[PDB]
A paper describes a structure:
The asymmetric unit (ASU) of the crystal structure presented here consists of four RecU monomers (two dimers) and two dsDNA molecules. The two protein dimers are constituted by chains A plus C and B plus D and the two DNA duplexes are constituted by chains E plus F and G plus H. Each RecU monomer displays an α/β architecture and the structure of the protein is identical to the previous structure of unbound wildtype RecU with no indications at this resolution of any kind of large conformational change. The 33 residue long NTR could be completely modeled for chain D. For chains A and C, the NTR could be modeled from residue 23 and 26 onwards, respectively, whereas for chain B we could not model any of the NTR residues. Duplexes fit along the concave surface of the mushroom cap of each monomer, which also contains the active site pockets. The β-hairpins from the monomers cross over and extend toward the DNA duplex bound to the body of the other monomer in the dimer.
RecU has a mushroom-like appearance with a cap (residues 34–55 and 90–199) and stalk sections (residues 56–89).
Numbering used by the authors:
A (entry chain A): 23 to 199
B (entry chain C): 26 to 199
Write the structure that this text describes.
DNA sequence: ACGCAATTGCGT
DNA sequence: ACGCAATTGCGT
DNA sequence: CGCAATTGCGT
DNA sequence: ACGCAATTGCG
């Protein structure tokens, strides 16, 4: 975990949203965790007593959205994606299943959405809109959302110290009067 | 090899009950996968990139969850064979803390154990209790019969095997 | 898997 | 007709 | 992250 | 000294 580097604009990294979650944790505001990345652990070894060191394992494509949890007894689910492209946000770094799921997750009523970090700016795009840009892609046409319609389609978030990323104050400002 | 015991694992049995649930739009539940910290990933051009060394960590979050009917659902699934009693040695402190936070936030928070050839849907407060007594250097287990009213026997069926959705359907919101 | 170099192709 | 925004893809 | 072994409580 | 209960050890 000794990573001397290297800057993004910005994850950043688990530090950015992650710290926000811990904070939300220890102030009894919400329980939101990042579902961990699903490996298929083909081969493990057990050297020198404990502990184990998987010698061969492969990456699986997830099926669920990146983050989930509880706020005010409601379900929270969301993906977070960031881009350095100064012009637009690549819709292509979303993937099939994630969207299938956001769909199913909004099936029963949930707060399902997307946090986007691009244009030196963290944005909160509701899942609705995202679904528009998705089948805009899906019929045919633009595989990205240009800024002037990301800013036009999404709510900007305020990035401070402390909650670093304060998405709950939007989910509050919007789904809870 | 996916099941190296005498009694069925409860791994598949539950995460199949979940598939049914999903496919029929009854509700959305998914097991959080096991956390591992990757260390090295060799990446051939053809072969999919092989993670060649990696280590387990141990997540706090109680390892099932999702949505049902607009309300955040959560639980755990331990499973014990011994007909003796059921050992709290399975659940850890962090898990308990977590699902403490959860019910501290209007969460619905089962505990599912398939002990004694039966599937026990165990409400949270009751588990807390056992863990509490236990924390007072008391009974480090739940004896075979004391859960038997502390907990509900889930309705083990065929379409959805260890149907618990309707237990939670019954308590809340009716 | 991802950044990020390569490459496409829209736009005017 | 050519630039520079959108995409593809190849490389640790 | 388990089932085979260990030991201790307690008729 | 067993059922039954708790606790090392590495497959």
């Amino acid at each position: 975990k000794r990573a001397p580097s290297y800057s993004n604009r910005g994850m950043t990294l688990e530090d950015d949203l992650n710290e926000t979650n811990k904070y939300y944790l220890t102030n009894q505001i919400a329980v939101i965790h990042k579902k961990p990345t699903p490996v298929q652990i083909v081969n493990v070894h057990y050297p020198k007593r404990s502990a184990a060191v998987i010698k061969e394992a492969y990456f699986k494509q997830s099926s669920t959205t990146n983050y989930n949890g509880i706020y005010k007894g409601r379900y929270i689910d969301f993906e977070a994606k960031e881009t350095k492209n100064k012009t637009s946000f690549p819709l292509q770094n979303f993937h099939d299943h994630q969207i299938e799921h956001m769909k199913q997750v909004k099936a029963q009523d949930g707060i399902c959405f997307v946090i986007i970090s691009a244009f030196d700016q963290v944005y909160f795009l509701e899942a609705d809109k995202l679904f528009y840009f998705w089948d805009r892609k899906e019929k045919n046409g633009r595989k990205s959302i240009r800024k002037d319609e990301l800013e036009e389609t999404a709510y900007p978030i305020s990035l401070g110290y402390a909650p670093r990323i304060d998405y709950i104050s939007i989910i509050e400002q919007l789904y809870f009067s």
